[PDB]
Enzyme design. Structure first.
Site, short mmCIF file in Angstrom:
data_model
loop_
_atom_site.label_atom_id
_atom_site.label_comp_id
_atom_site.label_asym_id
_atom_site.label_seq_id
_atom_site.Cartn_x
_atom_site.Cartn_y
_atom_site.Cartn_z
N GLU B 357 0.75 -1.19 0.09
CA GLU B 357 -0.05 0.05 -0.02
C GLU B 357 0.81 1.03 0.13
O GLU B 357 0.39 2.33 -0.45
CB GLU B 357 -0.97 -0.04 1.33
CG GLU B 357 -2.10 -1.13 1.12
CD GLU B 357 -3.12 -0.54 0.10
OE1 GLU B 357 -3.38 0.70 -0.28
OE2 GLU B 357 -3.47 -1.71 -0.78
N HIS B 487 -16.30 -7.16 -8.29
CA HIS B 487 -16.10 -6.03 -9.30
C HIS B 487 -16.83 -5.95 -10.48
O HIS B 487 -17.27 -5.15 -10.90
CB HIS B 487 -14.61 -6.47 -9.75
CG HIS B 487 -13.57 -6.16 -9.09
ND1 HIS B 487 -12.95 -7.09 -8.17
CD2 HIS B 487 -12.87 -4.87 -9.02
CE1 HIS B 487 -11.94 -6.73 -7.38
NE2 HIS B 487 -11.88 -5.27 -7.93
#
Ligand code: NAG
Ligand code: NAG
Ligand code: NAG
Ligand code: NAG
Lengths: 248, 596
Positions: B357, B487
């Site tokens: 991240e 998604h």
């Protein structure tokens, strides 16, 4: 005030302590253009007009003589050979608030280039195209007045530093007021050099039985030879005589 | 009196206006994730409506500018992104069906249910209940019951809802003068106005399909190898003549096969690469974990983190009453504000996610000098592939021994690297056939040359051929299992994951040749080379201001999609994979054998 509303006031008839800036230990943008910081303390020029404004962190270098940019063109342009100094320091602890500092505005667009050292205060809107704007926002009005947003969580590039600019230029007006000069404790009964305000010489210092009225600074007795001075640092009257000399 | 000077005036007005509204939306979205409160739900709807209405106003003003005379390319890319109408084409009675459906999807997915039918005792959520039953238990009967606990109790009420979604999202393209909604997602990769650099929209379908004929022979040998060590545990429970079940491929979605390494370890006698026990003898905490990660990046050459992040952000899970979700997401609030939102733990996965991240954050300040409309990645695949090249380097034994996590005397033989390389093969090679097949089905059904009765018989027949899975039970047309994924239901383009792999290894070979590493790409390192750090940051800082096809010419010099620099990474693995499958039946045909 705002960057587009920078003030202009004359500083005169007072002593300017530039030495307090050196030991402040808080400024990180101490640069001088056309002059040395050490040599401007004893000697100075008139027209001590001070301009105060706030400049964002990423555009600090834009505010400089001989340098162009975005703020440097339509907000405040510094002319070439600007004999002055720039000092900036961070103001995050006081000049910031959560949600955005909605107190500083600026002008982003203007039709023509700005003359150096003039301030324009108007609500005129930009006219990029041939079609005029009738007061209603459209495709060509582009209201240049925008409010910057400063937050404590902003990055170092977006950190608003507090900057003040002092201008020093030489004009026909004489008798400017400068900063202070060092003083040294008087020594008595010794041939010691002295350089008071406007006069200097070499001689021995001794106590004087004579008395001076409180509005003379020094005095002479015969053939324009100074024999008594009164330093205002002490309010004491002294005698000066050339120290011992002769032919062997 | 020029359009070029007229465009720079408008984008300068939008940049200062949007960054005030974007900071309010990003700050509002941050307090929602950090703190869950009643008024905060009302607070999000207050900031989100005026932010969505602001883009409605900017899109109408840029429409009257004609696009047939702007020779400048910097403002052409900005106007193409700003002129996307989106929801303004829909009517008022049809646009209210947008915010209603999307908020219903989030609330429906949040309902956790494992209560048994006709026996309603109790059932808990997903994290303490569902993950333990898929990662620890080894019983076929109850997992088969759990398979019917979600596709026949949740997906049955989506059949009238998802079909209504796919008949109106397809209609915007004709109202926007496009061909279909699948061509709309290809507009992010469309480049026009540059001589010799133009990328047609229809050539991408052909080029993606052309690169898949070398992915397939690698995936044939992967499925053949993994089938010999799983039938050992189930002698009479699985027949060794057919394929594998779908609900035995590691995760809920089957994206990553990382969880089968413990069950299907080749040689478990020597210990695995596990340093969880190494940090607890020296009493490592959250602060010392991230301090050595920051100095790793500044050793490469990237700039260090700012001072407005360490004393402002949160790192661990604070208190006991704060039950806020801390799903690992990257935050770009703008104006120099960068935060990381996750709950730290002393585990294998959270340590790798901690490196992962941060890479998106390290990409974000690189294009900070760019304008707001160009303050993004070159495409949707750049921002994900940039965040993964440091993940490949941080997992190397050389980097782990550099910080001091590994033992000072840890030999590096063949088998200590095959265990690591096969872990990387399951997370990289295994996700390539799944991304292409699912995105290929969605593009043609949005194009429309597929009738209603041939959806399932074609979807299942490619799973048996490409993936190689026999259906454990026949399913009729009332099921809607392809729409259950996150998604596909939430309108996310899945092609950014296919181009992520082909980009993250083009950059890896280019950067390793600059450092003149003598050896294979798995053992290559980036650290202790200041020449490579200044070279990378100049190309990182460009962003979207330049076309992405020029970004390829900046690293490898080849304008096409090269497939050669991927087999060279797996040459030590491929020659070993070729000897074990000398006699096994590699390559499946159509197979109705088990359930005829
Ligand atoms: C100024 O004169 C006064 C009176 O003699 C003296 O006390 C003072 O110390 C002098 N200057 C300063 C401020 O030190
Ligand atoms: C196109 O516009 C950009 C504005 O950022 C400018 O820098 C560039 O010089 C322009 N290109 C040409 C060929 O004028
Ligand atoms: C967006 O909607 C307006 C409304 O009429 C239309 O004129 C315009 O062509 C649309 N833009 C696109 C790209 O479809
Ligand atoms: C790895 O295998 C090769 C041959 O396959 C052998 O030459 C080499 O010595 C092995 N490495 C170690 C550390 O044993």
């Amino acid at each position: 005030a705002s960057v587009y509303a920078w003030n202009r006031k004359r500083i005169s008839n007072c002593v300017a302590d530039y030495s307090v800036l050196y030991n402040s230990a808080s400024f990180s943008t101490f640069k001088c253009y056309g002059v040395s910081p050490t040599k401007l303390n004893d000697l100075c020029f008139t027209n001590v007009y001070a301009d105060s404004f706030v400049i964002r962190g990423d555009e600090v270098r834009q505010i400089a003589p001989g340098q162009t940019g975005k703020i440097a063109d339509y907000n405040y342009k510094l002319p070439d050979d600007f004999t002055g100094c720039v000092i900036a320091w961070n103001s995050n602890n006081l000049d910031s608030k959560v949600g955005g500092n909605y107190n500083y505005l600026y002008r982003l667009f203007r039709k023509s280039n700005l003359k150096p050292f003039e301030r324009d205060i108007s609500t005129e809107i930009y006219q990029a195209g041939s079609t005029p704007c009738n007061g209603v926002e459209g495709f060509n009005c582009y209201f240049p007045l925008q409010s910057y947003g400063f937050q404590p969580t902003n990055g170092v590039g977006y950190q608003p530093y507090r900057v003040v600019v002092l201008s020093f230029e030489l004009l026909h007006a004489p008798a400017t007021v400068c900063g202070p000069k060092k003083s040294t404790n008087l020594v008595k009964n010794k041939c010691v050099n002295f350089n008071f305000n406007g006069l200097t010489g070499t001689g021995v210092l001794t106590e004087s039985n004579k008395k001076f009225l409180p509005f003379q600074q020094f005095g002479r007795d015969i053939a324009d030879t100074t024999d008594a001075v009164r330093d205002p640092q002490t309010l004491e009257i002294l005698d000066i005589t050339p120290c011992s000399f002769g032919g062997v | 009196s020029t359009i070029e000077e007229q465009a720079k005036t408008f984008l300068d007005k939008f940049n200062h206006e949007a960054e005030d509204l974007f900071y309010q939306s990003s700050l509002a979205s941050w307090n929602y994730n950090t703190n869950i409160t009643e008024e905060n739900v009302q607070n999000m709807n207050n900031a989100g409506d005026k932010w969505s209405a602001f883009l409605k106003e900017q899109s109408t003003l840029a429409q009257m500018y004609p696009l047939q005379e702007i020779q400048n390319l910097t403002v052409k890319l900005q106007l193409q992104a700003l002129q996307q109408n989106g929801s303004s084409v829909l009517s008022e009675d049809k646009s209210k069906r947008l915010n209603t459906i999307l908020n219903t999807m989030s609330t429906i997915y949040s309902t956790g249910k494992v209560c048994n039918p006709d026996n309603p005792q109790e059932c808990l959520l997903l994290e303490p209940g569902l993950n333990e039953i898929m990662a620890n238990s080894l019983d076929y009967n109850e997992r088969l019951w759990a398979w019917e606990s979600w596709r026949s109790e949740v997906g049955k009420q989506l059949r009238p809802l998802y079909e209504e979604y796919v008949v109106l999202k397809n209609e915007m393209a004709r109202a926007n003068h496009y061909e279909d909604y699948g061509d709309y997602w290809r507009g992010d990769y469309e480049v026009n106005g540059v001589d010799g650099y133009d990328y047609s929209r229809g050539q991408l379908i052909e080029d993606v399909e052309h690169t898949f004929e070398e992915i397939k022979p690698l995936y044939e040998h992967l499925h053949a190898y993994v089938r010999a060590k799983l039938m050992n545990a189930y002698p009479s429970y699985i027949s060794p003549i057919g394929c594998l079940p779908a609900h035995l491929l590691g995760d809920m979605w089957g994206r990553f096969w990382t969880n089968l390494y413990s069950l299907t370890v080749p040689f478990g006698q020597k210990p695995n690469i596990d340093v969880t026990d190494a940090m607890v003898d020296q009493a490592w905490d959250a602060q010392r974990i991230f301090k050595e990660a920051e100095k790793f990046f500044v050793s490469v050459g990237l700039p260090n983190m700012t001072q407005g992040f360490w004393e402002n952000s949160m790192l661990t899970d604070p208190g006991n009453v704060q039950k806020a979700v801390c799903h690992p997401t990257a935050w770009d609030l703008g104006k120099g504000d960068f935060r990381i939102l996750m709950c730290t733990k002393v585990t294998m996965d959270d340590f790798l996610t901690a490196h992962h991240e941060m890479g998106h954050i390290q990409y974000d300040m690189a294009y900070a000098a760019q304008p707001f409309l160009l303050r993004n990645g070159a495409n949707e695949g750049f921002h994900e592939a940039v965040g993964e090249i440091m993940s490949l380097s941080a997992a190397t034994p050389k980097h782990l021994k550099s910080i001091g996590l590994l033992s000072p005397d840890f030999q590096e033989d063949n088998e200590t690297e095959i265990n690591f390389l096969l872990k990387q093969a399951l997370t990289i090679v295994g996700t390539l056939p799944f991304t292409y097949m699912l995105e290929k089905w969605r593009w043609m059904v949005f194009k429309g040359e597929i009738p209603k009765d041939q959806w399932m018989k074609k979807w299942w027949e490619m799973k048996r051929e490409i993936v190689g899975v026999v259906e454990p039970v026949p399913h009729d047309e009332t099921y809607c299992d392809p729409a259950s994924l996150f998604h596909v239901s939430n309108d996310y383009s899945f092609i950014r994951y296919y181009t992520r792999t082909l980009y993250q290894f083009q950059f890896q070979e280019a950067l390793c040749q600059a450092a003149k590493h003598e050896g294979p790409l798995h053992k290559c390192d980036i650290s202790n080379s200041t020449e490579a750090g200044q070279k990378l940051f100049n190309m990182l800082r460009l962003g979207k201001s330049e076309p992405w096809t020029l970004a390829l010419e900046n690293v490898v010099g080849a304008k096409n999609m090269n497939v050669r620099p991927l087999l060279n990474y797996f040459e030590p693995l491929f020659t070993w994979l070729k000897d074990q499958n000398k006699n096994s039946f590699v390559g499946w045909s159509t197979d109705w054998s088990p359930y005829a």
